Amino acid sequence: LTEHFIITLPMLLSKYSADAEKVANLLQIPQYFDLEIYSTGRMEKHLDALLKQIKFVVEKHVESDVLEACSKTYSILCSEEYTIQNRVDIARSQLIDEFVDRFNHSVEDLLQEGEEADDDDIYNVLSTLKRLTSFHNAHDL
Amino acid sequence: VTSKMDEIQQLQKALLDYLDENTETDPSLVFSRKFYIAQWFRDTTLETEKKEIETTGQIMHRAENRKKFLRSDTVDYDDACLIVRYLASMRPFAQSFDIYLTQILRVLGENAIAVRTKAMKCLSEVVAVDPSILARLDMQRGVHGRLMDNSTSVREAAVELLGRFVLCRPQLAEQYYDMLIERILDT
């Protein structure tokens, strides 16, 4: 299962990124990996492909379950008994810089007079806030 | 026994594209690429040595090699396995086993006991891998000679060979049975 899906999963995410249910199903796959195989197989580039594609997927959907699943996958990936941890944690830190910058826009827009609480800004803040809550549930920020 | 049963340059090109993709996948493949390049280069020169017809052929060959090295689709894994198996099966290694056999038969007449014993034992292993090799007449006369040899060690080795060979192939064993069952009284 590991050897197969390390090759196949990024292509699947690329294929069906628009569909929330399919990615939500697929995200349960990494919870069962033997994580040694990323090291012994010499396959870290496919891991990089996985994190890039999953990043794009996170950026395109807002249904809560996918965010829960992706966060849990990163929790499994940031297991500190395996050598791989540091790379994914750094990329995660880049994601959290992205999230905080959007948060900075959110706090500045609401605090100022701005556009007088227009619905569109509220929707942007709400979507970003949902992503922050979902990631923050599993990880110390 | 488990494997066998200008286009060559195009195959070289194809393998180069396979490895080239794998460079992206995984480092250290560049070394293999350069190594294969050098090996093709030396093999074309060595066949050149054996002329002007093949001189012009090899100068386009070698110039294309230089160009293609400077040049650093859709072909995948199993394809690469079969191509490189073929190109290896062209190389002067797959047709070496035969030669090796000949060498072994030089050993059987020697003036040291242990070496002949071990040679016979390894041959017994060889035949018990590939049972259709008791056909060449020289090996036949060899095992007969060693069956009559004057030292108990090689004698037991030879009879073990003949017995295991008889056991493996069920039929066609009544031709060695007589020469086998003669040997019980061997002191």
For this PDB entry, the determination method is: cryo-EM
* CB-CB contact of A10 with A55 (8 Å): no
Burial of B123 (0-12, 13-18, 19+ CB in 10 A): buried
User: Which positions in chain B touch A8 (Cβ < 8 Å)?
Assistant: none
Q: How far is CA A94 from CA A17, A72, A98, B23, B150, in A?
A: 21, 18, 6, 27, 82
* CB-CB contact of A71 with A138 (8 Å): yes
Helices (H), B52-111: 52-70, 77-90, 97-107
Interface mutation target, options A40, A42, A44, A50, chain B, most CBs of B under 10 Å: A42
* CB-CB contact of A92 with A107 (8 Å): no
Helix (H) or strand (E) holding A3: helix A2-16
Cited resolution, angstroms: 5.3
C-alpha to C-alpha distance for A30 and A40, rounded to whole angstroms: 17
Query: A–B: how many Cβ contacts below 8 A?
Result: 6
CB spacing of B24 vs A42 below 8 angstroms: no
User: Which positions in chain A touch B26 (Cβ < 8 Å)?
Assistant: 42-43, 45
A61's tokens: 């959907």
Minimal CA separation from A86 to chain B, in Å: 20
C-alpha to C-alpha distance for A59 and A53, rounded to whole angstroms: 10
Q: How far is CA B82 from CA A3, A96, B19, B43, B93, in A?
A: 22, 48, 14, 20, 17
Interface mutation target, options B24, B26, B29, chain A, most CBs of A under 10 Å: B26
